[PDB]
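Sample entry (130 residues):
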Amino acid sequence: MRFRPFTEEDLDRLNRLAGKRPVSLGALRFFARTGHSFLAEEGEEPMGFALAQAVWQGEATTVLVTRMEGRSVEALRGLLRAVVKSAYDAGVYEVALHLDPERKELEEALKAEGFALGPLVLAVRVLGSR
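Predicted structure, serialized as tokens:
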């Protein structure tokens, strides 16, 4: 298992991991530039990815993970660790992401990597695209 930044040449790798929610090249390019996004692979096989960016919240920075995918707890843990280290080296105050409670592997990985789960819940109103 290894963890590294991804580039445009990794589009197919990320999309092999993305299920029915593809990653566009535009999204790949944005996230490759943040310094907080990574890909996991076991040998040549893609095993996970994390898309994240720094968000100023007025007094401090949160690194917000938009998306994480992973085929094993090990992959997810290592991605969490890479995101956390990129946040820590940059003096970022916290790392946040949204957990779907049915994703049991991610729940296990978050806990193992020292994340507090809840009690805040995501409230969303979808307006749609032009």
